[PDB]
Amino acid sequence: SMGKLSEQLKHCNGILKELLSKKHAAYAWPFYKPVDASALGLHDYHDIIKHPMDLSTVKRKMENRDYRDAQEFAADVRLMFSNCYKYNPPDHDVVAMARKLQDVFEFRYAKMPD
Numbered sequence: 001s002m003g004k005l006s007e008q009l010k011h012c013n014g015i016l017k018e019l020l021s022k023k024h025a026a027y028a029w030p031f032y033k034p035v036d037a038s039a040l041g042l043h044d045y046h047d048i049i050k051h052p053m054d055l056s057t058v059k060r061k062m063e064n065r066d067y068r069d070a071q072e073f074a075a076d077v078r079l080m081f082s083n084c085y086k087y088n089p090p091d092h093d094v095v096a097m098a099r100k101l102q103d104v105f106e107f108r109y110a111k112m113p114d
């Protein structure tokens with residue numbers, strides 16, 4: 001393999017599986033598919049959020065070898081969360097859910113050895 005990079009991408013793949021898993025579903029589910037701005041009525045979503053991201057897209061990119069390394073994977077997970085914080089008011093339910101999921105992500109990702 002390309003060894004350590006490859007190892008760390010496998011580690012990321014496990015983090016992604018965890019984020020998608022039933023144990024986190026109570027707060028992760030808004031992040032399972034792209035934001036459907038039409039259905040939600042967010043007429044300006046794509047005007048404010050230039051680079052949408054969600055866990056299904058992270059999964060697709062992982063599987064398609066589009067990430068060089070764990071840092072690029074993490075950047076997309078963080079982009080997903082940051083888009084949520086960017087678009088929404090701080091008191092919104094989805095922002096709270098994003099934080100709750102982010103603190104799982106950040107703890108798991110931080111445990112990856114350098």
Ligand SMILES: COc1cc(OC)c2c(=O)[nH]c(-c3cc(C)c(OCCO)c(C)c3)nc2c1
Nearest residue numbers: 029030031035040041042084087088089092094
């Ligand atoms: C169903 O999944 C989602 C995922 C989302 O982000 C990951 C969002 C999201 O970022 N904002 C909203 C959202 C929905 C409505 C109806 C809102 O009121 C618009 C009228 O004032 C606002 C402020 C946010 N819904 C999501 C749903």
